[PDB]
Design an enzyme around this catalytic site. Structure first.
Site, mmCIF file in Angstrom:
data_model
loop_
_atom_site.group_PDB
_atom_site.id
_atom_site.type_symbol
_atom_site.label_atom_id
_atom_site.label_comp_id
_atom_site.label_asym_id
_atom_site.label_seq_id
_atom_site.Cartn_x
_atom_site.Cartn_y
_atom_site.Cartn_z
ATOM 1 N N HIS A 1 10.484 6.635 -2.802
ATOM 2 C CA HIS A 1 9.929 5.661 -1.837
ATOM 3 C C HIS A 1 10.949 5.342 -0.785
ATOM 4 N N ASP B 1 16.183 17.344 30.495
ATOM 5 C CA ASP B 1 16.014 17.513 29.045
ATOM 6 C C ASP B 1 17.284 16.883 28.449
ATOM 7 N N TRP C 1 18.034 4.695 -4.581
ATOM 8 C CA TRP C 1 18.427 5.458 -3.339
ATOM 9 C C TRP C 1 19.900 5.450 -3.085
ATOM 10 N N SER D 1 21.278 16.991 10.298
ATOM 11 C CA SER D 1 20.238 16.795 11.312
ATOM 12 C C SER D 1 20.633 15.631 12.180
ATOM 13 N N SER D 2 20.962 14.479 11.618
ATOM 14 C CA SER D 2 21.244 13.241 12.367
ATOM 15 C C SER D 2 22.603 13.308 13.067
ATOM 16 N N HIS E 1 25.659 0.195 5.031
ATOM 17 C CA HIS E 1 25.498 -0.987 5.882
ATOM 18 C C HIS E 1 25.236 -0.502 7.360
ATOM 19 N N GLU F 1 23.912 2.202 8.230
ATOM 20 C CA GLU F 1 22.553 2.735 8.149
ATOM 21 C C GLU F 1 21.507 1.680 8.426
ATOM 22 N N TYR G 1 21.673 -0.897 10.311
ATOM 23 C CA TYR G 1 21.754 -1.160 11.755
ATOM 24 C C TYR G 1 21.197 0.040 12.554
ATOM 25 N N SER H 1 12.699 -4.888 23.160
ATOM 26 C CA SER H 1 13.091 -5.350 24.520
ATOM 27 C C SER H 1 12.107 -4.773 25.619
ATOM 28 N N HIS I 1 29.498 -6.537 0.957
ATOM 29 C CA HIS I 1 28.489 -7.513 0.574
ATOM 30 C C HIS I 1 27.383 -6.875 -0.295
ATOM 31 N N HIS I 2 27.424 -5.556 -0.495
ATOM 32 C CA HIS I 2 26.552 -4.888 -1.477
ATOM 33 C C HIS I 2 27.229 -4.837 -2.872
ATOM 34 N N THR J 1 23.021 -11.362 16.989
ATOM 35 C CA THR J 1 21.599 -11.126 16.718
ATOM 36 C C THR J 1 20.792 -12.293 17.256
ATOM 37 N N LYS K 1 19.998 -11.921 20.917
ATOM 38 C CA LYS K 1 18.849 -11.039 21.152
ATOM 39 C C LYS K 1 17.568 -11.805 20.945
ATOM 40 N N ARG L 1 15.628 -6.186 -9.994
ATOM 41 C CA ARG L 1 15.178 -4.964 -9.319
ATOM 42 C C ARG L 1 15.074 -3.768 -10.230
HETATM 43 C C1 HEA Z 1 16.688 -2.949 8.933
HETATM 44 C C2 HEA Z 1 17.283 -3.271 7.840
HETATM 45 C C3 HEA Z 1 18.256 -4.373 7.586
HETATM 46 C C4 HEA Z 1 18.845 -5.250 8.414
HETATM 47 C C5 HEA Z 1 18.777 -5.158 9.910
HETATM 48 C C6 HEA Z 1 19.598 -6.114 7.593
HETATM 49 C C7 HEA Z 1 20.236 -7.115 8.206
HETATM 50 C C8 HEA Z 1 21.118 -8.016 7.476
HETATM 51 N N1 HEA Z 1 21.255 -7.994 6.066
HETATM 52 FE FE1 HEA Z 1 20.436 -6.678 4.749
HETATM 53 N N2 HEA Z 1 19.698 -5.336 3.469
HETATM 54 C C9 HEA Z 1 18.867 -4.297 3.734
HETATM 55 C C10 HEA Z 1 18.295 -4.003 5.107
HETATM 56 C C11 HEA Z 1 18.700 -4.769 6.217
HETATM 57 N N3 HEA Z 1 19.495 -5.825 6.264
HETATM 58 C C12 HEA Z 1 18.599 -3.372 2.679
HETATM 59 C C13 HEA Z 1 17.838 -2.148 2.578
HETATM 60 C C14 HEA Z 1 19.319 -3.963 1.578
HETATM 61 C C15 HEA Z 1 19.313 -3.544 0.166
HETATM 62 C C16 HEA Z 1 20.211 -2.351 -0.068
HETATM 63 C C17 HEA Z 1 19.955 -1.854 -1.505
HETATM 64 O O1 HEA Z 1 20.650 -2.473 -2.381
HETATM 65 O O2 HEA Z 1 19.092 -0.994 -1.778
HETATM 66 C C18 HEA Z 1 19.923 -5.152 2.120
HETATM 67 C C19 HEA Z 1 20.878 -5.936 1.417
HETATM 68 C C20 HEA Z 1 21.583 -6.975 1.944
HETATM 69 C C21 HEA Z 1 22.695 -7.590 1.295
HETATM 70 C C22 HEA Z 1 23.150 -7.370 -0.149
HETATM 71 C C23 HEA Z 1 22.440 -8.295 -1.124
HETATM 72 C C24 HEA Z 1 22.499 -7.773 -2.556
HETATM 73 O O3 HEA Z 1 22.309 -6.588 -2.892
HETATM 74 O O4 HEA Z 1 22.824 -8.738 -3.431
HETATM 75 C C25 HEA Z 1 23.222 -8.594 2.124
HETATM 76 C C26 HEA Z 1 24.412 -9.362 1.886
HETATM 77 O O5 HEA Z 1 24.995 -10.067 2.688
HETATM 78 C C27 HEA Z 1 22.440 -8.454 3.398
HETATM 79 C C28 HEA Z 1 22.737 -9.259 4.527
HETATM 80 C C29 HEA Z 1 22.132 -8.966 5.826
HETATM 81 C C30 HEA Z 1 22.532 -9.812 6.937
HETATM 82 C C31 HEA Z 1 23.288 -11.004 7.090
HETATM 83 C C32 HEA Z 1 21.795 -9.118 7.997
HETATM 84 C C33 HEA Z 1 21.928 -9.551 9.463
HETATM 85 O O6 HEA Z 1 22.041 -8.369 10.266
HETATM 86 C C34 HEA Z 1 20.749 -10.440 9.854
HETATM 87 C C35 HEA Z 1 20.994 -11.127 11.200
HETATM 88 C C36 HEA Z 1 19.758 -11.841 11.669
HETATM 89 C C37 HEA Z 1 19.537 -13.160 11.778
HETATM 90 C C38 HEA Z 1 20.501 -14.174 11.190
HETATM 91 C C39 HEA Z 1 18.205 -13.683 12.321
HETATM 92 C C40 HEA Z 1 18.220 -13.859 13.854
HETATM 93 C C41 HEA Z 1 19.200 -14.893 14.264
HETATM 94 C C42 HEA Z 1 18.983 -16.129 14.824
HETATM 95 C C43 HEA Z 1 17.574 -16.601 15.141
HETATM 96 C C44 HEA Z 1 20.173 -16.982 15.275
HETATM 97 C C45 HEA Z 1 20.443 -18.214 14.451
HETATM 98 C C46 HEA Z 1 20.747 -17.926 12.998
HETATM 99 C C47 HEA Z 1 21.722 -18.480 12.259
HETATM 100 C C48 HEA Z 1 22.696 -19.527 12.718
HETATM 101 C C49 HEA Z 1 21.925 -18.141 10.829
HETATM 102 N N4 HEA Z 1 21.510 -7.438 3.269
HETATM 103 O O1 LIG Z 2 22.798 -3.626 4.509
HETATM 104 O O2 LIG Z 2 22.126 -5.140 4.894
HETATM 105 CU CU LIG Z 3 24.642 -4.367 4.241
#
Ligand code: HEA
Ligand SMILES: [O-][O-]
Ligand SMILES: [Cu+2]
Ligand SMILES: CCCCCCCCCCCCCCCCCC(=O)OC[C@H](COP(=O)([O-])OCC(O)COP(=O)([O-])OC[C@@H](COC(=O)CCCCCCCCCCCCCCCCC)OC(=O)CCCCCCCCCCCCCCCCC)OC(=O)CCCCCCCCCCCCCCCCC
Ligand SMILES: CCCCC/C=C\C/C=C/C/C=C\C/C=C\CCCC(=O)O[C@H](COC(=O)CCCCCCCCCCCCCCCCC)COP(=O)(O)OCCN
Ligand SMILES: CCCCCC/C=C\CCCCCCCCCC(=O)O[C@H](COC(=O)CCCCCCCCCCCCCCC)COP(=O)(O)OC[C@@H](O)CO
Ligand SMILES: CCCCCCCCCCO[C@@H]1O[C@H](CO)[C@@H](O[C@H]2O[C@H](CO)[C@@H](O)[C@H](O)[C@H]2O)[C@H](O)[C@H]1O
Ligand code: CUA
Ligand SMILES: [Mg+2]
Ligand code: NA
Ligand SMILES: [Zn+2]
Lengths: 227, 75, 40, 143, 513, 56, 91, 49, 102, 72, 258, 70, 44
Positions: free
Chosen positions: E61, E91, E126, E156-157, E240, E242, E244, E255, E290-291, E316, E319, E438
């Site tokens: 998945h 191109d 994964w 590829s990427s 991490h 990835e 982004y 945008s 943080h993972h 963020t 944005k 999980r």
């Molecule tokens: C597109 C995918 C994507 C994105 C963009 C993010 C974005 C972020 N992720 Fe996430 N994350 C995942 C996909 C993603 N994550 C995935 C797949 C996992 C699991 C991995 C696995 O174990 O399989 C995961 C796991 C995960 C973990 C690990 C948790 C664990 O396994 O115990 C943490 C830890 O800090 C985290 C934090 C964040 C933070 C802080 C952001 C930041 O980038 C978010 C920033 C955004 C905002 C904060 C909102 C907008 C902001 C405002 C409106 C301004 C005002 C806000 C404040 C003052 C707070 N993510």
């Molecule tokens: O990786 O959130």
């Molecule tokens: Cu991460």
């Protein structure tokens, strides 16, 4: 343990888990407030026929955009890091217990005095006694003294596992070749449950943890009886 | 003695080396004491600490390897 | 955006046909497997 | 006024309340009477009839602001159709329950749950807020 | 002719098309795997089998959704179609190498499906952590076929990233600075830099895993003096960045969509948007552990990773608030693509905020390896990356095809998928706070109500996916040809007509200084 | 050696409609056919090997 | 100590076309940014083309991030829809 | 000229809502789904030992 | 200042030889701003329409004044009131007089 | 210039190679092999190698590479 | 066209390359698990055919057809820099694994580095010779570059031949060192790190030497002009990369890790 | 005759008014949430533990038959 | 090559019912595959 239709954390059994509840309340208030503000502003931007489509100056408003979020993050990080260091503080444990993860059950070693060790397996569903909990009971509970600082050491003899007890605020990975430390202190007697928290193969869902907290004198006689 | 005390050498979640060091220390003290016909009771503190901290299978494996001649630590 | 009227208009009945065929292409094969799980 | 695919690089007509005066007239080709009307428009507009004024508007523009800004009944179709398809989804869930899912564990039997509930209250599950906190140990009943 | 055009392509638009078709097919495979997960969970007990078959489905998945649906659609599909058009380029820089980036993906996907067909599959997650993924606990070919699938996806990427960065840097009109390129183009270039730097570290790590499994190395095996935790550091150093990579092209699309359907000539705060994307890209490299908050690292390390991860909220936020400021004063067109983008702003914000909760190590101890993590990432993936994909698909479908969708059908589709994804994932916050782990095929009975509801939401999202297939069929069936598109003066990709000719910009744009 | 680049420029610029991979002449066609036959044949063999490896 | 060909000797195809054009100060393959005129109706920007229309992008003011894009057709000078700058096609 | 929505919108909204409610209420209540609600205020505890 | 802004726009539309492109650029630029244009600006634009023999664009300008007021229903009738002498002098019918508000 | 980089090639770089070649020539010759000890962290075998008898490394040297059971 | 960019003729080599990657990966799977090298040998053969015909066509496009304008050459410069950056980050993973394991030696090793029972090579013997060899080859390829810029065919050929000879010397020395090494890839994390990191570097030396050999034959055939020779620039950039990786291996694994 | 209404800045005036309103509401919600959730929770835990008798709780559990060890 | 709507794609849109078949096979094969793989793993 969890109860049906639960929304939030299991009630705190340890002082650190209490601290985590109040820190979560603080952080969730912020999350609500920011989510609500964004939803409200979206609705505000989308509910007028008035228009302004010429170029808009950004630098004034970007100071607010960045400073106010920066202050909010400081207001989350200060109490966050206070609790992170509280957890780490030197405490002087009375007892050390080891747990070894295996596919699929936990072993426990109490080796401060005598060679006490045993295996702890899930009770199959078809063997539950009336009133017992599906997937959560074990044959041999981890009996421990209440109101005492305990050092838990966690390892594995095969793949990764992770040794969790939510109501005590505990989760410590079980890694072969590594001996991870956490501290456990229950404010109350009782039965406190947790479940393997690292994918470990066919029966990951089925290797739970049950702590059974009692007065020191009962713990001492149980210990002697398990040799 | 209740359990192994806090040791400022090993203040972090990873306690592997605390187990290892106390196992080494016990066996080094035991060899020193047996060589001169000394007394192994002087080594007891290291024995209690490694027995408290160390997984039974780690001690068992290390003991096997010391007997086999394949223990990789210096004793 | 603006556009021309359809070159080949798809009537309500034709859309019901397309929608029903689409849904069945997803639902029947998965349905057959899940119905027969016990058999497997 | 027929718009052609091969016209895509030419200035085009738009009705947009934010672009009131588009780049071209809605109607560029004029009949004999429409040519006469554009000549009459060079004289006092007080001498144009209401009909002639409307015709001049309709040569220049396709829809009025009121027309281009009109509300529609489309929300009713969207909401009703979405509810239809969400309802269809329940049919798939009924099918799954009937043909795919077998019986659930015996621990959901009423007598099991009544015994499990007592044992949870005897071990004081969640006694501060979550669960046992809602039981009156003095009255032997839920609060 | 057909072979020369579609197997031998050197054309950015045709290669874009191939990526969109591949990603659409991979979405169906990912949606089926999603439904299997929620069918297993949707009542207490065991439906399919034990956790091995279950976690084969969970693992596949994630790989399919990430590597075969989101990346190919956003970067291969929207990137190839849009980037050259938005800079007036004829191109890509390396138009033949671009074709190999596409053709590596069918074989990569073949290797993934082979992994699930041989032995008992790769039931690893994964993340593919050892020792579960090693040659004792996962004996046989499954995990090696998974590794090779990621090798091909990775090549590829990486080659695609080289192509994008070169094209964006080198193939703009001579008068156009980097500060006169659209935000989508910036979002792709930054995504490509993240790819370039992150994928090679994943490649190193999975190659170490391969050698531990087949050549008797012991990188991750304590018996040889290895460390399973080293694999975690190498995988997350990639993983991490990835996430982004998965979101940034989406931010670029958002945008454009918000600007367009607000009736604006430009997004609010362009240079702040560029600053925010590069800041997110940079910060995304320094936060990976943080993972790993429950693995046993030192307290000071956990304090650093908590603090550096939280910092990301600041760019963020800029944005999100700039999208709001773009809406402000707009002549709002309530198009289906606008609905997707407005859903993205709100739901991505909620997921980002639950990510900020997770960033706190002390609280993560209790949330880690629970459904609270699953709730966070599906708000930013199923309601964020996917909402930007859907918005960009319905906005640019008439460009690509020359045909219009039925907007009423597309609004119905949005409404169904909006209900389904919220129903699916909102209750998973409660499961996670209350301690559901999980990667479980079954749960203690207390967790039944929210698991049931979540599985019902997954079925609503299935209905939306089936309806989207019909909607695409109805547009090709009906053949409503595009005439006029508004706002071409600030949306260069439309200025060649719908669809644009095979060769565009054979005569470059004229831009003076 | 002598500089024969000009003669290769003439060959590869001949107005004969051939794509660059075939413009050197009949040897290019042979090497293309060998390459594509080994690729497509090898791919079918990989699929056969999957069928075999998918059962015990 | 010689024997390496020069570009003058051996460059061919488009590369040679670009190199001979640069020697003459000519830019038929659009490598350079054109310099703006005052852009009035009397002094329009002159836009070369090999056909009867070409896309213009207008950076109306220095350092604008938004480029304004439109087709310029053979005939009377056209104006940027944002700043009114005049452009005239020279096929 | 009235469009599809003017002609059928009311019927689509009314029939859709009615269908949706009826089939979800049936699925929720009539086919043996176990929702596992809270015992609080619902279950009379019974001796288990 | 507001008076300076209004004067620039009055001057723009009052240029005797204003061409059609300039009339459209002016109105299409003006309606981007967060304001309903002052009657004096609209008067100058309507007089430009007259010099350009463009009756329809005069009517469209009156429609976009109403549109820019949004929910502020008091603005358009005020602007029409202030323009009545010019509408009478030039023979400009309002959108309402032409039925174009239906 | 070319002349300077040729001067560095023949005046510094190749002399350095020649001196290191001399140094290696002089310190070559077989050093005595150390007692075999079946250490568990060495001679790892978690899966047979995909060549030979499964138990020989790819550039196995019988003189200096013992098997898990000792020198051949 | 009136731009300076290269519209490439439709090509089969992307698809043959992608299929060669399927055959090599499924072939390694067949070799590791099904005791068979057949698929792998077909994949390696198709990969080599693909590489040969693709780069042949790039030479046809540029030397023979004139499509490499300055704008196209600038793109190829960025492409090769970005490719080398990706290769730097690939080796960074292997250096991270080496420092991880050696900075914190586990109890299984004896809690020491090098591990108990490991007898490292003397970094002052063949490893120092290998260092002098690759540093000398960096000097010789710089001579070759300046000879080509100055229009000197004979000295370019001599310098590039010397550079290739040194790369071949390095490869033969490393092959001998592998055979003579008393430790193996199965010798725990010391053998693992040593052989995988030096072994990927050896592969890169072989790739870089092959690239230099292509440049040698192209120079023999008068392809390069004194001003236009990007294939030689790219080969030299790649070769400097191979040298720098070696210096980091030498300091890290052979010297500091001994 | 109709009075001259405000004609300038209507969007900005609307924005200023509603952003102030959103601030005032956010402060109201933080006060409610402090009272309904966070203080409620602090008080529930403080009240539970103020006169809590861990031995009495243990004796209740023991007499109910819950323990393996008692 | 063919230009314009319906021609810049690798599939035919000339007949909407042949197209429906092709789209059914295409999307339906991807959605069916995981169910048949589960079946395959259960029958070992
Ligand atoms: C597109 C995918 C994507 C994105 C963009 C993010 C974005 C972020 N992720 Fe996430 N994350 C995942 C996909 C993603 N994550 C995935 C797949 C996992 C699991 C991995 C696995 O174990 O399989 C995961 C796991 C995960 C973990 C690990 C948790 C664990 O396994 O115990 C943490 C830890 O800090 C985290 C934090 C964040 C933070 C802080 C952001 C930041 O980038 C978010 C920033 C955004 C905002 C904060 C909102 C907008 C902001 C405002 C409106 C301004 C005002 C806000 C404040 C003052 C707070 N993510
Ligand atoms: O990786 O959130
Ligand atoms: Cu991460
Ligand atoms: C369309 C989609 C379909 C919907 C999907 C299905 C939703 C399920 C319905 C939930 C209702 C549950 C219920 O029975 O509530 C009654 C419940 C009974 O009261 P209670 O037993 O006193 O519980 C209150 C807890 O003490 C309160 O304290 P606590 O410790 O028990 O629990 C805290 C807890 C509880 O948090 C909540 O209750 C979440 C609020 C609900 C959504 C809004 O959980 C969370 O943290 C959830 C995390 C959410 C992430 C952030 C979400 C952003 C919010 C978006 C804001 C937008 C503007 C509004 O009352 C509620 O709180 C209502 C909810
Ligand atoms: C002169 C030095 C050059 C050496 C090259 C020679 C031969 C093989 C090629 C190697 C390529 C490089 C690294 C691959 C992994 C391991 C080989 C390491 C180098 C080497 O050759 O190591 C040997 C072991 O080879 C073994 O196991 C043999 C292993 C053979 C099969 C390797 C499996 C392939 C791995 C897959 C590659 C994945 C890459 C993906 C790319 C990333 C996507 C972006 C060492 O011999 P030994 O007897 O143990 O000890 C010496 C005792 N006297
Ligand atoms: C046992 C070993 C097997 C392993 C497989 C790999 C083995 C060998 C690969 C060796 C690499 C050979 C590359 C030959 C490239 C020849 C084409 C070339 O050099 O083409 C040049 C352009 O450069 C360009 O494309 C530049 C093209 C450069 C790319 C090459 C870099 C190496 C890629 C290696 C593959 C990566 C493997 C990594 C393992 C993890 C042509 O332009 P000029 O030179 O300016 O000429 C024009 C003048 O004549 C005009 O006057
Ligand atoms: C997660 C995605 C799946 C969502 C659920 C899909 C809903 C199911 C769609 C219908 O699927 C069919 O259901 C029939 C039953 O209704 C099955 O017939 C089976 O049952 C019939 C009734 O007993 C017999 O007549 C048939 O022979 C027998 O194959 C049939 O095979 C199957 O294709
Ligand atoms: Cu043990 Cu999961
Ligand atoms: Mg974990
Ligand atoms: Na289940
Ligand atoms: Zn301009």
């Amino acid at each position: 343990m969890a109860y049906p239709m639960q929304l939030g954390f299991q009630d705190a059994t340890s002082p650190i888990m209490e601290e985590l509840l109040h820190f979560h309340d603080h952080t969730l208030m912020i999350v609500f407030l920011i989510s609500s503000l964004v939803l409200y502003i979206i609705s505000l931007m989308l509910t007028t026929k008035l228009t302004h489509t010429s170029t808009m100056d950004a630098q004034e408003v970007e100071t607010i955009w960045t400073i106010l979020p920066a202050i909010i993050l400081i207001l989350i990080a200060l109490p966050s890091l206070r609790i992170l260091y509280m957890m780490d503080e030197i405490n002087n444990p009375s007892l050390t217990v080891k747990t070894m993860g295996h596919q699929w059950y936990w072993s426990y070693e109490y080796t401060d005095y005598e060679d006490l060790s045993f295996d702890s397996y899930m009770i199959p569903t078809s063997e539950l006694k009336p009133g017992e909990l599906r997937l959560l009971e074990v044959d041999n509970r981890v009996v421990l003294p209440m109101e005492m600082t305990i050092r838990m050491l966690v390892s594995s003899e095969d793949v990764l596992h992770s040794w969790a007890v939510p109501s005590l605020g505990l989760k410590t990975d079980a890694i072969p070749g590594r001996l991870n430390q956490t501290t456990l202190m229950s404010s109350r007697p009782g039965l406190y449950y947790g479940q393997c928290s690292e994918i470990c193969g066919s029966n990951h869902s089925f290797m739970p943890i049950v702590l059974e907290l009692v007065p020191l004198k009962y713990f001492e006689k149980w210990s002697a009886s398990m040799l | 003695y209740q359990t192994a005390p806090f040791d400022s050498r090993f203040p972090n979640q990873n306690q592997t080396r605390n187990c290892w060091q106390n196992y080494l220390d016990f066996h080094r003290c035991e060899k020193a004491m047996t060589a001169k016909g000394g007394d192994v009771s002087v080594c007891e503190w290291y024995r209690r600490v490694y027995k408290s901290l160390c997984p039974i299978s780690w001690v068992s494996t290390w003991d096997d390897r010391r007997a086999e001649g394949t223990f990789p630590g210096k004793i | 955006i603006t556009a021309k009227p359809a070159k080949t208009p798809t009537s309500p009945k034709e859309q019901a046909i397309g929608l029903s065929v689409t849904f069945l292409s997803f639902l029947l094969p998965a349905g057959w497997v899940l119905y027969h799980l016990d058999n497997y | 006024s027929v718009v052609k695919s091969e016209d895509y690089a030419l200035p085009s007509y738009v009705d947009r309340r934010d672009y009131p005066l588009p780049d071209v007239a809605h109607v560029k080709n004029l009949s004999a009477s429409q040519k006469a009307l554009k000549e009459k428009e060079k004289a006092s507009w007080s001498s144009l009839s209401i009909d002639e004024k409307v015709e001049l508007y309709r040569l220049k523009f396709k829809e009025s602001f009121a027309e281009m800004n009109r509300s529609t009944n489309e929300w009713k179709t969207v909401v009703g159709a979405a509810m239809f398809f969400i309802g269809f989804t329940a049919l798939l869930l009924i099918w799954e329950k009937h043909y795919v899912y077998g019986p659930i564990p015996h621990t959901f039997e009423e007598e099991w749950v009544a015994k499990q509930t007592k044992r949870m209250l005897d071990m004081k599950v969640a006694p501060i807020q979550g669960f046992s906190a809602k039981w009156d140990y003095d009255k032997n009943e839920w609060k | 002719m057909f072979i020369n055009r579609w197997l031998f392509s050197t054309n950015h638009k045709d290669i874009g098309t191939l990526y969109l078709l591949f990603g659409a097919w991979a979405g169906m495979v990912g949606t089926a795997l999603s439904l299997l997960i929620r069918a297993e969970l949707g009542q207490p007990g065991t439906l399919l089998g034990d956790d091995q078959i279950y976690n084969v489905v969970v693992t596949a998945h994630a790989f399919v959704m990430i590597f075969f649906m989101v990346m190919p659609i956003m970067i291969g599909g929207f990137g190839n179609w849009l980037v050259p058009l938005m800079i007036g380029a004829p191109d890509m820089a390396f138009p033949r190498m671009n074709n190999m980036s596409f053709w590596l993906l069918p074989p990569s996907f073949l290797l993934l499906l082979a992994s699930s067909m041989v032995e008992a599959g790769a039931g690893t997650g994964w993340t593919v952590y050892p020792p579960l993924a090693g040659n004792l606990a996962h004996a046989g070919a499954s995990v090696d076929l998974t590794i090779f699938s990621l090798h091909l996806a990775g090549v590829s990427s990486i080659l695609g990233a080289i192509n994008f960065i070169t094209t964006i840097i080198n193939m703009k009109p001579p008068a156009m600075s980097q500060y006169q390129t659209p935000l989508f183009v910036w979002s792709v270039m930054i995504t490509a830099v993240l790819l370039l730097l992150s994928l090679p570290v994943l490649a190193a790590g999975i190659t170490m895993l391969l050698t531990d499994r087949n050549l008797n190395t012991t990188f991750f095996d304590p018996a040889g003096g290895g460390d399973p935790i080293l694999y975690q550091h190498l995988f997350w150093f990639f993983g991490h960045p990835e996430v982004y990579i998965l979101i940034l092209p989406g931010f670029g699309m958002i945008s454009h969509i918000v600007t367009y359907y607000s009736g604006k000539k430009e997004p609010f705060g362009y240079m702040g948007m560029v600053w925010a994307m590069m800041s997110i890209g940079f910060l995304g490299f320094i936060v990976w552990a943080h993972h790993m908050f429950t693995v046993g690292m030192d307290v000071d390390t956990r304090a650093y990773f908590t603090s550096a991860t939280m910092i990301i909220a600041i760019p963020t936020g800029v944005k999100v608030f700039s999208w709001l400021a773009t809406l402000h004063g707009g002549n709002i067109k309530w198009s289906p693509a606008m609905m997707w983008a407005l859903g993205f702003i709100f739901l991505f914000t909620v997921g980002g905020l639950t990510g900020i909760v997770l960033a706190n190590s002390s609280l993560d101890i209790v949330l880690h390896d629970t459904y609270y993590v699953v709730a966070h990432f599906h708000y930013v993936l199923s309601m964020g990356a996917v909402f930007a994909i859907m918005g960009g698909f319905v906005h640019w479908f008439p460009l690509f095809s020359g045909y219009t969708l039925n907007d009423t059908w597309a609004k119905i589709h949005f409404a169904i998928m909006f209900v389904g994804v919220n129903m699916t994932f909102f209750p998973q916050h409660f499961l996670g706070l209350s301690g559901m782990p999980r990667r479980y095929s079954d749960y203690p009975d207390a967790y039944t109500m929210w698991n049931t509801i979540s599985s019902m939401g997954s079925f609503i999202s299935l209905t939306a996916v089936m309806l989207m297939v019909f909607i695409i069929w109805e547009a090709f069936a009906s053949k409503r040809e595009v005439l006029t598109v508004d706002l071409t003066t600030t949306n260069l990709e439309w200025l060649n007509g719908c669809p644009p000719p095979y060769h565009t910009f054979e005569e470059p744009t004229y831009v003076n200084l | 050696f002598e500089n024969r680049v000009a003669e290769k420029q003439k060959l590869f610029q001949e107005d004969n409609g051939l794509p660059v991979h075939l413009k050197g002449g009949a040897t290019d066609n042979i090497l293309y056919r060998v390459t594509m036959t080994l690729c497509l044949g090898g791919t079918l063999y990989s699929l056969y090997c999957l069928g075999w490896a998918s059962f015990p | 100590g010689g024997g390496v060909p020069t570009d003058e000797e051996q460059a061919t195809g488009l590369e040679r076309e670009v190199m001979l054009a640069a020697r003459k100060g000519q830019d038929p393959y659009n490598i350079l940014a054109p310099k703006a005129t005052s852009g009035t109706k009397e002094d329009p920007n002159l836009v070369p083309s090999i056909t009867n229309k070409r896309i213009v992008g207008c950076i109306c003011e220095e350092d604008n991030s938004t480029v304004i894009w439109f087709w310029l057709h053979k005939g009377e000078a056209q104006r940027c829809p944002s700043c009114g700058t005049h452009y005239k096609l020279v096929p | 000229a009235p469009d599809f929505h003017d002609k059928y919108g009311n019927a689509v909204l009314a029939s859709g809502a009615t269908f949706c409610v009826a089939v979800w209420v049936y699925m929720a209540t009539q086919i043996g789904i176990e929702w596992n609600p809270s015992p609080v205020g619902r279950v009379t505890p019974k001796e288990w030992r | 200042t507001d008076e300076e802004f209004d004067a620039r726009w009055v001057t723009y539309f009052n240029k005797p030889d204003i061409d059609a492109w300039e009339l459209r650029k002016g109105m299409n630029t003006l309606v981007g701003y967060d304001l309903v244009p002052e009657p004096k600006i609209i008067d100058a634009a309507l007089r430009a329409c007259r010099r350009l023999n463009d009756f329809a664009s005069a009517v469209r300008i009156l429609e976009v004044v109403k549109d820019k007021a949004g929910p502020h229903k008091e603005i358009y009738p005020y602007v029409i009131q202030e323009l009545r002498p010019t509408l009478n002098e030039l023979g400009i019918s309002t959108p309402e007089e032409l039925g174009l508000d239906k | 210039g070319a002349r300077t980089w040729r001067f560095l090639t023949f005046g510094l770089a190749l002399p350095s190679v020649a001196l290191c070649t001399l140094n290696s020539w002089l310190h070559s010759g077989h050093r005595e092999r150390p007692a075999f000890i079946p250490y568990h962290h060495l001679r790892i075998r978690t899966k047979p190698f995909s060549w030979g008898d499964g138990n020989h490394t790819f550039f196995h040297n019988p003189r200096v590479n013992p098997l898990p059971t000792g020198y051949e | 066209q009136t731009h300076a960019y290269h519209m490439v003729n439709p090509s089969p080599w992307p698809l043959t390359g992608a299929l060669s990657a399927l055959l090599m990966t499924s072939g390694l799977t067949m070799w590791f698990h099904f005791n068979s090298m057949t698929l792998l040998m077909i994949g390696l053969t198709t990969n080599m055919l693909t590489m040969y015909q693709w780069w042949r066509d790039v030479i046809r496009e540029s030397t023979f057809q004139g499509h490499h304008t300055p704008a196209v050459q600038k793109g190829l410069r960025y492409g090769m820099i970005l490719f080398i950056i990706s290769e730097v980050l690939f080796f960074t993973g292997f250096f991270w694994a080496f420092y991880h394991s050696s900075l914190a030696p586990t109890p299984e090793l004896g809690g020491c580095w090098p591990p108990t029972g490991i007898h490292p090579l003397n970094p002052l013997e063949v490893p120092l010779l290998n260092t002098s060899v690759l540093l000398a080859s960096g000097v010789s390829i710089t001579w070759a570059h300046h000879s080509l810029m100055e229009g000197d065919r004979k000295h370019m050929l001599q310098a590039l031949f010397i550079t290739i000879t040194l790369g071949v010397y390095f490869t033969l020395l490393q092959a001998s060192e592998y055979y003579e090494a008393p430790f193996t890839i199965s010798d725990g994390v010391y053998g693992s790190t040593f052989f995988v990191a030096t072994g990927f570097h050896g592969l890169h030396v072989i790739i870089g030497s092959t690239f230099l050999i292509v440049c040698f034959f192209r120079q023999l055939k008068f392809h390069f002009t004194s001003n236009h020779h990007f294939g030689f620039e790219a080969a030299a950039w790649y070769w400097h990369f191979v040298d720098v990786v070696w210096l980091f291996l030498y300091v890290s694994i052979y010297w500091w890790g001994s | 005759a109709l009075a001259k209404p405000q004609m300038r800045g209507l969007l900005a005036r609307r924005l200023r008014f509603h952003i102030v309103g959103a601030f005032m509401v956010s402060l109201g919600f933080a006060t409610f949430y402090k009272f309904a959730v966070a203080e409620k929770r602090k008080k529930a835990y403080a009240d539970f533990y103020r006169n809590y008798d861990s031995m009495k709780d243990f004796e209740e559990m023991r007499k109910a038959g819950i323990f393996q060890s008692a | 090559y063919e230009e314009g709507p319906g021609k810049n794609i690798p599939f035919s849109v000339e007949n909407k019912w042949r197209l429906l078949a092709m789209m059914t096979l295409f999307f339906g094969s991807g959605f069916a595959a995981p169910f048949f793989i589960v079946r395959h793993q259960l029958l070992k």
